[PDB]
């Protein structure tokens, strides 16, 4: 009944707009742009496909993606969904019925997929409509964890669900593989901010994994738990202050020598108009019994 009219589009212009480098953990994105002329024969229910590469997703830090409708003035020309291959299928409305000379433009942001692109390095991104494609080689740079003397830490936020008011934060503690004596981690709101995070025994769930080979760690902060050793039951998780958690890492010799992954599944306050603004602080001694801390801030604008 409906026809795939991809091949009948004309004047198809596809561009990937970015700089030389994309920094996913800075919430960097590329802009995907598509312009085309629609055939006069097009009717309601006709479709076309945008091919999106496996290196990209359309959701970014959010759990689900919503494809923007293609507009003709203040009317909807086409509605889009993401199929199971990650490609976008647009279906034309009755706007095209009894119209000629119809043209369209649509732009949407796209994000580097952390499961598909686990490491820093060049990737060639290709997108298209039919055999009309665009390609661009870009450096994907996840940059490095923070370090202060023998203390290292970094975290990233993903899986923000604004319907169910949830978020995920993945933290690497001691990714440098230093010796840290009497380590502790706290998770907090960033000072001098209206932050929408609810951190407490009800709202926060924490899993901890020991990393026996640091080469197994993704630079993208994609984590498959089965790759690591779940040690949740051997750490001590508490909530000593309002909107703060603490994790202690007791060991038989009072130090750690390996990285740990801390996976926080938390909640957002729907009453807040603030941003999701989190501070992770790692504490410990070095071998000269100097007590230090270092913090890592993650912030997602709402």
């Amino acid at each position: 009944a409906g026809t795939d009219i991809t091949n009948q589009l004309t004047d198809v212009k596809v561009t990937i707009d970015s700089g030389t480098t994309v920094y996913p953990h800075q919430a960097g994105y590329v802009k995907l742009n598509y312009g085309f002329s629609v055939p006069n024969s097009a009717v309601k229910g006709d479709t076309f496909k945008i091919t999106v590469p496996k290196e990209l997703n359309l959701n970014g830090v959010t759990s689900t993606a919503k494809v923007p409708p293609i507009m003709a003035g203040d009317q909807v020309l086409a509605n889009g969904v993401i199929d199971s291959d990650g490609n976008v299928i647009y279906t034309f409305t009755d706007y095209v019925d009894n119209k000629e000379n119809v043209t369209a433009n649509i732009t949407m942001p796209a994000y580097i997929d952390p499961e598909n692109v686990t490491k820093t390095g060049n990737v060639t991104l290709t997108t298209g409509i039919g055999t009309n494609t665009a390609s661009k080689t870009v450096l994907i740079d996840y940059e490095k964890y923070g370090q202060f003397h023998n203390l290292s830490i970094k975290g990233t936020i993903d899986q923000i669900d604004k319907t169910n008011n949830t978020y995920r934060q993945t933290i690497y503690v001691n990714p440098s593989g230093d010796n840290v004596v009497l380590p502790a981690l706290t998770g907090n709101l960033i000072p001098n901010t209206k932050s929408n995070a609810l951190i407490d025994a009800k709202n926060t769930d924490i899993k901890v994994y020991r990393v026996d080979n640091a080469n197994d760690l993704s630079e993208s902060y994609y984590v498959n738990p089965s790759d690591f050793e779940d040690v949740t039951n051997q750490v001590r998780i508490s909530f000593p202050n309002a909107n703060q958690y603490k994790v202690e890492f007791p060991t038989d010799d009072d130090q750690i020598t390996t990285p740990y992954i801390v996976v926080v599944n938390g909640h957002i306050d729907p009453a807040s108009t603030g941003d999701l603004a989190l501070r992770s602080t790692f504490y410990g001694y070095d071998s000269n019994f100097i007590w230090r801390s270092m913090s890592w801030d993650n912030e997602v604008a709402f």
Partner: antibody
Amino acid sequence: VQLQESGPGLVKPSETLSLTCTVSGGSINNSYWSWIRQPPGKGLEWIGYLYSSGRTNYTPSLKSRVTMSVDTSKNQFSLKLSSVTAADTALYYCARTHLGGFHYGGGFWFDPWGQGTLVTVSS
Amino acid sequence: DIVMTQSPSSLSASVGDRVTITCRASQSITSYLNWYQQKPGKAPKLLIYASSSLQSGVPSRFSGSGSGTDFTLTISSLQPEDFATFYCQESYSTPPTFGQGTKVEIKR
């Protein structure tokens, strides 16, 4: 918990001073321990620490002459100081070393101390 | 391993007098300052740790205060048995610096 130092009270110049600290009324395990010395009528000088697992840290000025070791089965740890001279004549103390950790926001202190044992370097 | 300056080198005070001993660090050491008492022919004994915490069993006439660079040991009412050399000790880093000591003599 009581600590007791033991070892020769007389050592010849250029040879090695050896002392042992015996822990009683408690266990040596899962703790840090230090050696600290005091020349007669002078102040205190920390020499180094050992954790019961065997890791150590020695004061930079003495590191090239110091060895500390532990035998947890005997509830004892030891100090060896090589290339001795009259400058090493002192009371030698062992002491349990506590770390303040998160609760105290850092720091460390020495408690309890042994009785001290005098070593004289002389020909 | 921070330079410390303990004052005074000695003092003489009567029983019941208030006595103050001070320690100055050359850079800030937060709360990382301990006090020891050394009686004649005895090892040092911990009196105060982490600036202000009193060791168990130590009389409450002994108090510690201060933060940053400047620390004070106070004896509110000097007693005969308090005769000793007192030492501060910073715990910012190993090797820890001990103060030069204060010899407390009792006037009678």
